[PDB]
Design an enzyme around this catalytic site. Structure first.
Site, PDB file in Angstrom:
ATOM      1  N   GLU B 137      25.237  49.830  44.127  1.00  0.00           N
ATOM      2  CA  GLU B 137      25.823  51.036  44.769  1.00  0.00           C
ATOM      3  C   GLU B 137      27.129  50.726  45.509  1.00  0.00           C
ATOM      4  O   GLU B 137      27.307  51.293  46.574  1.00  0.00           O
ATOM      5  CB  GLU B 137      24.831  51.685  45.753  1.00  0.00           C
ATOM      6  CG  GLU B 137      23.368  51.231  45.702  1.00  0.00           C
ATOM      7  CD  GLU B 137      22.522  51.605  44.493  1.00  0.00           C
ATOM      8  OE1 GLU B 137      22.987  52.408  43.699  1.00  0.00           O
ATOM      9  OE2 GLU B 137      21.387  51.099  44.377  1.00  0.00           O
ATOM     10  N   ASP B 208      52.926  41.800  32.800  1.00  0.00           N
ATOM     11  CA  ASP B 208      54.008  41.536  33.800  1.00  0.00           C
ATOM     12  C   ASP B 208      54.557  40.113  33.591  1.00  0.00           C
ATOM     13  O   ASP B 208      55.790  39.964  33.469  1.00  0.00           O
ATOM     14  CB  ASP B 208      53.561  41.851  35.241  1.00  0.00           C
ATOM     15  CG  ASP B 208      53.863  43.279  35.705  1.00  0.00           C
ATOM     16  OD1 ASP B 208      54.537  44.031  34.948  1.00  0.00           O
ATOM     17  OD2 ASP B 208      53.427  43.645  36.829  1.00  0.00           O
TER      18      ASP B 208
END
Lengths: 545, 545, 545
Positions: B137, B208
């Site tokens: 969770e 990148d």
């Protein structure tokens, strides 16, 4: 807790000192009144925390007004700086303009990365709420935009690039916001924005009313002259009509947009038009308009793009649950030519009579498109058929169906009208790929096609029965299954002819097990019969074996 | 505001005291320099607030470095604890490694629930940015991951389970993040992770450049050896190629993954391959690659999974807007057998020549698949047809089409080649369900099928015309509409035969209104005719009534 | 830092003073124990910050209990106020009930806008966690809901409207939450809620266990008596079965819901049923259930809505990866009538034997539906065909196919049974639109249809061969291509008849190049032949030209 005459001065001290976070308090600690700011420049990533809320009202937390003649309130810029600013922004702040007709901006961001504006408000001014230039990896979610914009204003603008086309707005999230009662573009971009990877997802957009500065020109809620990769999904759009402050459509995309733009799963209420797409690759699906109180069904996108668009209908349901505009009823197996692959760039153009209004222009001596043949059809026992909808630009266009450089069939294309052109592929001719080429002298416009397996092939052949005496008969040349279908023939139709066969008893004799045949024509009249027919034809049926 | 020599010691005081929130300040209050931490253990849900930002730069808010030889910076664990820790985490903090080649981790989380890491950064180290074990969770959204990982590193790892397979990573949100300039798996899982209900949605991923530790092996941006329910949707992926630090593909799924994994609506730029799926149930649709500066179109997923995958093409558009790879052209009505229901577990396997490369292996005396007959076809007046593409593993495979335990038709399957097998269902035979079974002695590989209504049926029957005197005729046995179609016959083709019918005049006589017939063959030669044919055949047409 | 006996009193001082933000501390500064509140009224947008967490546990941050007999803890209302409250809410707070069987609510919000409840918890009480009435533009994301509800309780309720139907819940986000171990509706709405633009996206829902108050009636996780525009997408749902606290289904939609509701791309585990749709426009697609430990495949939605629903199957995969319930096998080209547009509101109703169980009821003298003809078919050279599945409510229903007010074909509809009704459109009859009308005296139930191009047309005509002498022949009247197909005929089948043609030699003579023909019938028996046939029929084949 900083030294100066006004808030503009008080705050600048913090910036010169170069503090990382500058907490600001509510309307209680400044006695009912909002801290006023004007033309402040921020050259480093400064956070401005608040104790305010996303909301309209100005009586219960951090609230900020612009100063009476200020061009902007804040301008988070890295212009002239040697290290690009990366971070900070506005949190929990009800930002405001000086007057309801003030022009200029509220926030500018320039030469920046990782800007964030969470749980704020942008309102009451006739200019731009947020103006972005060379702003990357940012996030503007959970805000209100209200009573912004007009002829020189709007909500969020993606401005021109700074220097190179790569100095743009990109990797920007606009989520969980509410836009209402505004003018101009509610989100927009310039002819030189070059934006890429933009999320506009799970927002509310609703008219609500006309603000202080009504629109002067036909307007669009989302107005993007340029836009590359974009998610425009799972939004509400409500009451955008011409009479309600001239929102003639929901989305406009400009002629030099690249896409791919995904306009999907938006839920519209009483909107007049999806809008206008003049460029880019645009995918639209899963959109539904409840017409509500509107007097007309939503209009579909107008498409004039030079590139593939896949525009499924915006479904129109009336308020009582009745569909009045459903899914487009396409010809079975229809494929628009621009969905297919090919070796030549072929701009799409508008033709009102094309199945999707979008058609390819294919010059002389050029490939239309090429596709792969399904594996299941490549068993040497499958007849296939191509129907292509085409219009000559002028006399002398020709379409050839080919297997690589081998020519299977050619059709002359009629000038000025849309007609369906049928090409069969015999079972012994089908290989890995097929292509259609313009082998003529004029442009052809290509709408779309239907390609698939067929269980028959039509066959027409030369006959010369001549003059038959009483009871004499003529037998046609042999019709081989090789020439007819390229594979076993199961059976044939009754033969027909290029003229009347009065007084001829006609039957068919098999010449092999593989369905090769001749036609027999016998003079049943009891006197000399001068025949007139020169051609015979059947439908030939194919199964397998 | 706590007692000790170094920050490591200062902070541990807070933990022993057991304070709920531990605010940390910027680089101003420690004079330009970042608080350094190492091997800190946190056994309770402690919040660590900051005044920093998602960003690369280290000069303008909370910033944290790891200590020179530390294994981790923080380790939020509930190991040995008696109440599972539930809450807290990192907020507004630019976390960092000691050196650009330091191994180990930055954050470990173990035996935890409701962990959150909002508006932070994870960077400059060659190990793992975040290592999760038995973490439930939780939420990791709005962060940067940069210059992480390498041969022993990566962004986020879902590690082995702690004890039981149910002690795993589950109900985890990874949203609104930016990943760039990294090595190893950018998000990954082990051969014993067993992760479930994972959201990887609306992130940017971009190459990148190559960081300090280049990749040593062929790599994948998303590399999940195991993965159950997962949403991988509405992401950007940019410039992932072999030559750009060996990103040979975007996604790899391991052989023991369960799924269902949804790889949908991702917008790729100059990526080399979607990647490799070796297991699990995987659904891919709505993905589009702009090829940009790449020299080649994106490659499609390689699929070797033992389970149903539904992999629609990643569309490849060139930078000028031209489609070079479109939707797969499927045979009309094609269904892969693994999409159908059935009573027996049948592993899928790879065959380069299957329509989707994925085919079922069906042993002797086993059901292939079973389906429901559409209601519209169940009117006693509909002829249907099954075409199934099949390959024998060895001699003696047989396919039967059945209505429950009743056998309608059987075909012997040829060993070693793909062939199409046709089964008709007469109108009086069609009930609620159909099934295909292997009733032979060898494995059959089943690719896919086409099932639907047909408007004809082919019919072949025994004849014995023998030797006919001048002008004599032979009449075939009656061909009942019951045996031909199981329903009224509308009409028939010209008859054909298993050999030449030279000198025979052939016609058809109806024997009832319901399209039952005989064929009449008359010696039209004027002397004795020795016939050679033993079979007659027609295409029979069916309408209704 | 405020004056009073208890926390209820301490906090009310702040409200009377009207402070914008009221920070609250952890269980340390109140010595292990949670600040208790009861019946507090908040008439202005007040923020209540915390230093707590989304979580179950009560031992490590801000925690709040309700007082022993309180109806509510907080009630953020603008009732009687003159400026609507706009902002504030609960942040970082573990809210709780007094006992595990306490009824009433925890939070009420009434006459409000821009309410937010981030990173909190709602638990342990048998009433409603959050009760919303006239709450607009709000957000409830990142919370826990646990051990809430029962016979008079639940998670989040959308209550009745306040005064006008427009005083409702709308523009509400419920995202990133976790719901577990609860009773009643986990999210729900009343028969007079009128909610609109609701996002329930990327949540976990899981049974976990039965709380203190078990369910007393058959229950649904999502139970919406009314609901307009709603996104219910990208959620997990886990172990909802009848035996596990009577969750008989995942979603129930009430008879007076409007939609459009999107139930899409949810990933279910061991759920018993998708649920029950009794009203509204509902779109369901991309949902998949892994059956896991459940003894049965998930059941599909039961649909009784009076409005168009588009319900694609929830796919059922067993734990070993085997499909046991696949996509629905539809008749090729099937369209449910409610997907088509039309000028009259026609309520849908349930019929177990309809292809989708949903069918239109069309009264006497009423349009069924109208559609546009594809452009490719409108070339004057295309024969089309309509097959419609229909059932008379009683004797005397008639279906007409029309081009505007021109009647092409009519069929009498049989009472009490589903039958397929075939209408051909000749090539010279096809214009811009087609419609089906009930031109009879009784209701007709209309299931769906198949519309498309055909390559043949069936033709039946009057003949009168009478009594033929030895060797005499009869020639049928001319069969013009105009009457047969409305365009050139390519060829015909062997002719068939309304009875036996024993002893007749039959052939076909062309009467023009355009495929007009007569049939010739010659007495080949050598004595008088009394014929019995009165009708002849062919299948006529059409190509182009």
């Amino acid at each position: 807790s900083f030294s100066g005459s006004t808030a503009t001065d008080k705050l600048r001290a913090a910036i010169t000192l170069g503090v990382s976070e500058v907490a600001i308090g509510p309307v209680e600690g400044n006695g009912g009144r909002p801290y006023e700011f004007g033309d402040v420049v921020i050259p480093y990533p400064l956070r401005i925390v608040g104790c305010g809320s996303q909301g309209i009202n100005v009586t219960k937390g951090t609230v900020l007004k612009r100063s009476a003649g200020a061009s902007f309130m804040f301008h988070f810029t890295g212009e002239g700086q040697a290290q690009r600013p990366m971070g900070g922004g506005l949190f929990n702040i009800n930002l405001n303009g000086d007057t309801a007709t003030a022009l200029g901006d509220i926030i500018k961001v320039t030469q920046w990365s990782y800007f964030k504006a969470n749980n704020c408000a942008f309102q009451n001014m006739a200019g731009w709420g947020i103006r972005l230039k060379d702003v990357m990896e940012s996030n503007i979610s959970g805000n209100l935009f209200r009573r912004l914009g007009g002829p020189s204003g709007g909500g969020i603008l993606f401005d021109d690039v700074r220097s190179a086309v790569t100095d743009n707005v990109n990797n920007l999230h606009i989520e969980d916001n509410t836009f209402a009662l505004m003018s101009g573009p509610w989100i927009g971009s310039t002819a030189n924005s070059n934006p890429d990877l933009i999320w506009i997802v799970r927002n509310k957009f609703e008219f609500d009313g006309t603000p202080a500065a009504p629109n002067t020109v036909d307007s669009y809620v989302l107005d993007f002259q340029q836009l590359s990769r974009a998610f425009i999904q799972d939004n509400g759009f409500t009451h955008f009509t011409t009479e309600r402050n001239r929102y003639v459509g929901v989305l406009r995309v400009g002629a030099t947009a690249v896409g791919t733009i995904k306009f999907e799963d938006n839920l519209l209420f009483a909107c007049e038009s999806a809008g206008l797409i003049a460029g880019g690759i645009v995918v639209s699906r899963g959109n539904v308009n409840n017409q509500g109180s509107a007097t007309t069904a939503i209009k579909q996108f107008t498409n004039t793009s030079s590139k593939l668009c896949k525009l499924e209908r915006v479904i129109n349901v009336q308020s009582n649950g009745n569909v009045s505009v459903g899914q487009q009823i396409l010809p079975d197996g229809y494929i628009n030519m621009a969905e297919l692959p090919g070796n030549t760039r072929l701009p799409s153009e508008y033709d009102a009579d094309g199945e999707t209004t979008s058609v390819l222009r294919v010059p002389a001596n050029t490939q239309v498109r090429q596709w792969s043949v399904p594996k299941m059809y490549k068993d040497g026992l499958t007849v296939t058929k191509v129907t292509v909808r085409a219009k000559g630009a002028a006399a002398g266009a020709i379409l050839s169906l080919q297997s690589g450089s081998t020519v299977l069939s050619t059709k002359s294309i009629d000038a000025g009208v849309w007609k369906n052109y049928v090409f069969y592929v015999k079972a012994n001719q089908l290989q890995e790929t097929l292509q259609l080429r313009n082998t003529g002298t004029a442009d052809v416009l290509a709408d779309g096609m239907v390609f698939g397996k067929v269980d028959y092939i039509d066959w027409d052949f030369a006959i010369a029965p001549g003059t038959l005496a009483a009871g004499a008969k003529y037998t046609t040349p042999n019709q081989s299954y090789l020439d007819v279908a390229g594979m076993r023939v199961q059976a044939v139709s009754i033969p027909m002819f290029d003229g009347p066969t009065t007084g001829l008893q006609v039957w068919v004799e098999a010449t092999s097990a593989n369905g090769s045949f001749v036609v027999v024509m016998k003079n049943d009249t009891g006197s000399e019969l001068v025949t007139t027919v020169t051609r015979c034809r059947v439908r030939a049926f194919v199964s397998k074996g």
